[PDB]
Structure 1
Amino acid sequence: AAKDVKFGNDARVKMLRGVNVLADAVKVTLGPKGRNVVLDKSFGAPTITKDGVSVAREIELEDKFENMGAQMVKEVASKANDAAGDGTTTATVLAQAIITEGLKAVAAGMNPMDLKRGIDKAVTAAVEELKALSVPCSDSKAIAQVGTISANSDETVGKLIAEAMDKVGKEGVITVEDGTGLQDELDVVEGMQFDRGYLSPYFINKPETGAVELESPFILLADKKISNIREMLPVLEAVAKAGKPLLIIAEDVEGEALATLVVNTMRGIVKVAAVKAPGFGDRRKAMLQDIATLTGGTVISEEIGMELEKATLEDLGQAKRVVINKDTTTIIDGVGEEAAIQGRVAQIRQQIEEATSDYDREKLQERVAKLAGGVAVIKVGAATEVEMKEKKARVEDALHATRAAVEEGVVAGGGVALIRVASKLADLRGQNEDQNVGIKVALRAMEAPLRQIVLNCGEEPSVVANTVKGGDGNYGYNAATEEYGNMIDMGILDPTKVTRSALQYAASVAGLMITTECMVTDLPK
């Protein structure tokens, strides 16, 4: 259709206004004295939340240009939460800060490209300074402390996570499930996890987590692409009876076929969910088999001349529970016989011997680790269905936090790590004055989080920022107690990874917007 095209300054102010609505809406929730945001609902009572992510999801503006602005930072900011399980709100306020000043410099006639180079240079320096400030979290004692802090001071959760990582390693698969009732349970079972999300939402039956959860599902492994859903009918009908959900793991499930699955499972007849097979090329055919052996299923490939129409329930794999993400699938408690699974592991370990390469070797180790490592299952305690669901949430979060802390350590939270890191780059310079401004723009932005946190407390940002900068190390401002001291000792910290991702992702979208000269959108007509 006819488009409305905006340029330079007009385009920029629109974007600015868009992110201002987004950021302004979200940042009110930042910090321990964060405010409530009321999100309306089509039917029922409004939602009252302090969850910056929930607010961000609801933001859509009427002005198409302003909306594009909001949707852009809204998008990369979410990339942060995906990478470290936290930081979107931070990334959002950081973005507003860089963009606001960056755009001012542009309007003042400064070179957009040089401004961007400066911001980027400052960010790289800052990330290094961040690694230096970072404190390790390698032993279970630390792992537990961090988990406890994440679970809102619940030593139980901290303990659980530490025990779980002790069982499968701090890089091992760990899942959480509702408990059988009062008292937690930690079990390691035959399972696996690969990087492939649902082939479309709709399959999502747990919107709170935006996840697909199947119970006692069959598993169809097909080494091919599915176009004509007719091929499936005979098998789907079989799965229809037996009343069990079905997970389709194919090379791919195309539009129409996928549409059929969504519609039909949505009508109660047959519950299905599909995801692409892990990896590509040859390591794909191999992994598809691993899952088969792990779940006791039979891979159905055209090469050998097998057909889907002739596939029976006996060809299907099986597991007690599968969980599908926006980009992850995890199979829990596969039926596969330990004899076959363990034997399969043996075959792969010889491959590693006969391995005439390091790459081919690393890939084989990855597979055994999956097949042999299993899956740690944390079953959250209870005493009333409500508390049980609430604790399960804290555990899930504490888990993501701990996982990140184990990868890159921790740093002073409350936004002081960022302001501390910037205070050290006071002499960072670029190749020209525009680049210098860019650097100052970024460093100045790194104070946004703290300042916002302080503003929410009803205090004076300039003063607290001034004082935190005055000290060094992990000396900061505890927004909760409204007292200064060592942020780590006071137990106020963020995984170095979350702060890093928030900053890099913010700096990314900000740099893109600052170097945008034209916007195209449909005419409001």
Structure 2
Amino acid sequence: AAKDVKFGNDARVKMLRGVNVLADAVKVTLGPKGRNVVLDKSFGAPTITKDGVSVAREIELEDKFENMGAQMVKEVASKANDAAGDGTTTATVLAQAIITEGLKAVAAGMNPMDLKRGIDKAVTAAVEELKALSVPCSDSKAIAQVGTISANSDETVGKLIAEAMDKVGKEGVITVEDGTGLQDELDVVEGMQFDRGYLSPYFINKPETGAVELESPFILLADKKISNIREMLPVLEAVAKAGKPLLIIAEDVEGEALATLVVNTMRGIVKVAAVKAPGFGDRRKAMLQDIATLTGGTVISEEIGMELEKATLEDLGQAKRVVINKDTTTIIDGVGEEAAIQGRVAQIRQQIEEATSDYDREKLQERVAKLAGGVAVIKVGAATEVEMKEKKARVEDALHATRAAVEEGVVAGGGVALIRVASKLADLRGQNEDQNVGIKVALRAMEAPLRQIVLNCGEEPSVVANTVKGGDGNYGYNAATEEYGNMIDMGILDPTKVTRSALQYAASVAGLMITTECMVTDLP
């Protein structure tokens, strides 16, 4: 199609306009006292939300270049949110800052590549300082505290999260589920989770969580690739007749088969989800065999001879629940007699015994840990079903925050951590004047989020930022009560992973956008 291209400064100012629109839309929700954003819907009743994720997702500008700028910033912010569990608004605000001062410096005639190098150096030093400043969260008390803080200062949610982590381990698989009755049940079942996401977003059954949930699906395990529909069509017909959903775990599903599956999914004829098998090579075969033993259904391997056409309904695996996220999927309480699992664990143990290379032994150890760890499911209970749904959402959010905290650690929230890091790094220097300008740009950008939070709070951002910079350690400003002091003690927590990932992804997108020289769009 016909293309219109912008070269140099005009493209950059279009980019800046787009990112400014996106960040102005999404930034008012930042902070405990954040403004509301009215999102119009075609249904008739607009949705009033103060969540940055929804506001960012709704933004789609008209001008093509501003639209692309907003789309890149939104994409990197979404990547940060998925990686960490939170911080998309912080990442967007940081990106808008870095882009604004970086493009302002570029217009001054400085070399964009040196600015990018300086920004990257400053962000690397900031990550190092943030790791130094991070407070570890490993014992049960800190886990419970983080869970409580994340779930709007609720002690029950933190207690449940800490109990689950103690039961299954800090690296174990923990899942929430609707619970019957007032009591909150917590039991460990035989399950598995591997980092594999849905093939297409149209497979999503729950748009609220952006995940694919299956009430009680069937498991299809084929080591071959699926491109044609005729081989698997008898199995799909059989499972549709059985009245249950189907999970397809193949090496790769694409072509006509994927399109047919997507069409059947959106038309509501049958609810089936397809996900690629974990790993590659013989590791993928071993994982498929492990899943087969867990779900009690023999894997369809064309090498030994069985085919998809001859596959029976009973040959398919079965499990209680299957949850597929954007990048990870979980199998919960797969049906299968326990001696098979014990035998598989034993064989993996001998494979450890004769394992020679370190990496193969590590992979097999990870395999056996995943297989024998199980899945600890939390069944949230409440007196009222809507209260139960709200508690389930809060518990899921607290679980994400607690997992991030256990991974990295906890640092002062509310933007205080970035302020402290910038104050520590104010003495950093590069190898050129442009690199030094980039470093200063990065430091001011790191200061920006706290300024935005206290601007939403209504105070003067400059005074609060200066006072927080003057302080040391975790001392900061609590916008909820308009008081200073130790942010950790006051209970304003942010996992180190969230802030680190937000800063890194904002820096990445800002470096990409600073060095852009041209863009190509379709004509309006």
Q: Do they fold alike, i.e. is TM over 0.5? A: yes
Q: For 1:393-452, what per-residue CA distance to the aligned partner results, in whole angstroms no more than 9, with x for missing partners?
A: 110011111111111111111101101110111110000111100000000111111000
Q: For 1:83-119, what per-residue CA distance to the aligned partner results, in whole angstroms no more than 9, with x for missing partners?
A: 1101110000000000000000000000101111111
Residue 263 of structure 1: how far off its partner (Å)? 2.0
- The separation in 2 between residues aligned to 1:201 and 1:472, in whole angstroms, is 46
- The separation in 1 between residues aligned to 2:323 and 2:295, in whole angstroms, is 15
- The separation in 2 between residues aligned to 1:242 and 1:11, in whole angstroms, is 57
- The separation in 2 between residues aligned to 1:95 and 1:523, in whole angstroms, is 28
Q: Is the 8 A contact 2:4 2:523 kept in 1?
A: yes
Q: CA RMSD in A?
A: 0.8
SS of 1:326's partner is coil
- The separation in 2 between residues aligned to 1:236 and 1:91, in whole angstroms, is 43
- The separation in 2 between residues aligned to 1:498 and 1:264, in whole angstroms, is 38
Q: Is the 8 A contact 2:223 2:302 kept in 1?
A: yes
Q: Is the 8 A contact 2:37 2:49 kept in 1?
A: yes
Q: For 1:175-216, what per-residue CA distance to the aligned partner results, in whole angstroms no more than 9, with x for missing partners?
A: 001111211110100000011111112211100011111111
- The separation in 2 between residues aligned to 1:125 and 1:301, in whole angstroms, is 50
Aligned length: 524
Q: For 1:370-401, what per-residue CA distance to the aligned partner results, in whole angstroms no more than 9, with x for missing partners?
A: 11001010011111111111111110011111
- Of the structure 1 ranges 75-84 and 94-103, higher mean CA displacement relative to structure 2 is found in 75-84
- The separation in 2 between residues aligned to 1:265 and 1:439, in whole angstroms, is 50
Q: Is the 8 A contact 2:36 2:50 kept in 1?
A: yes
Q: Is the 8 A contact 2:413 2:494 kept in 1?
A: yes
Q: For 1:59-84, what per-residue CA distance to the aligned partner results, in whole angstroms no more than 9, with x for missing partners?
A: 11101001110000111111111111
Q: Is the 8 A contact 2:202 2:265 kept in 1?
A: no
SS of 1:411's partner is strand
Q: Is the 8 A contact 2:228 2:255 kept in 1?
A: no
| Structure 1 residues not aligned, in runs of 5+ | none
Q: 1:352 — aligned with what?
A: 352
- The separation in 2 between residues aligned to 1:114 and 1:513, in whole angstroms, is 14
Q: For 1:282-323, what per-residue CA distance to the aligned partner results, in whole angstroms no more than 9, with x for missing partners?
A: 100110010000000110011011111110011101100100
Q: For 1:470-518, what per-residue CA distance to the aligned partner results, in whole angstroms no more than 9, with x for missing partners?
A: 1111110000000000000001120011010000000000011111111
Closer/same/farther in 2, CA of residues 522 and 265 from structure 1, 3 Å limit: closer
Q: For 1:351-373, what per-residue CA distance to the aligned partner results, in whole angstroms no more than 9, with x for missing partners?
A: 00110111000000111111100
Q: Is the 8 A contact 1:126 1:422 kept in 2?
A: yes
Q: For 1:229-285, what per-residue CA distance to the aligned partner results, in whole angstroms no more than 9, with x for missing partners?
A: 111121111111120100000111113111212222444433211000110111001
SS of 1:182's partner is coil
- The separation in 2 between residues aligned to 1:302 and 1:517, in whole angstroms, is 51
- The separation in 2 between residues aligned to 1:226 and 1:360, in whole angstroms, is 29
Closer/same/farther in 2, CA of residues 270 and 484 from structure 1, 3 Å limit: same
| Structure 2 residues not aligned, in runs of 5+ | none
Q: Is the 8 A contact 1:39 1:49 kept in 2?
A: yes
Residue 42 of structure 1: how far off its partner (Å)? 1.1
Q: For 1:25-67, what per-residue CA distance to the aligned partner results, in whole angstroms no more than 9, with x for missing partners?
A: 0000000110000001111310100000000001111010011
SS of 2:314's partner is helix
Q: For 1:311-338, what per-residue CA distance to the aligned partner results, in whole angstroms no more than 9, with x for missing partners?
A: 0011101100100111111000011110
Q: Is the 8 A contact 1:323 1:329 kept in 2?
A: yes
Q: Is the 8 A contact 2:189 2:333 kept in 1?
A: yes
1:78 aligns with 2:78: yes
- The separation in 1 between residues aligned to 2:362 and 2:492, in whole angstroms, is 38
Closer/same/farther in 2, CA of residues 436 and 268 from structure 1, 3 Å limit: closer
SS of 1:137's partner is coil
- The separation in 2 between residues aligned to 1:97 and 1:237, in whole angstroms, is 55
- The separation in 1 between residues aligned to 2:302 and 2:117, in whole angstroms, is 52
- The separation in 2 between residues aligned to 1:349 and 1:398, in whole angstroms, is 35
TM-score (structure 1 length as normaliser): 0.99
Identity %: 100
Q: Is the 8 A contact 1:239 1:270 kept in 2?
A: no
Q: Is the 8 A contact 1:80 1:91 kept in 2?
A: yes
Q: Is the 8 A contact 2:215 2:321 kept in 1?
A: yes
TM-score (structure 2 length as normaliser): 0.99
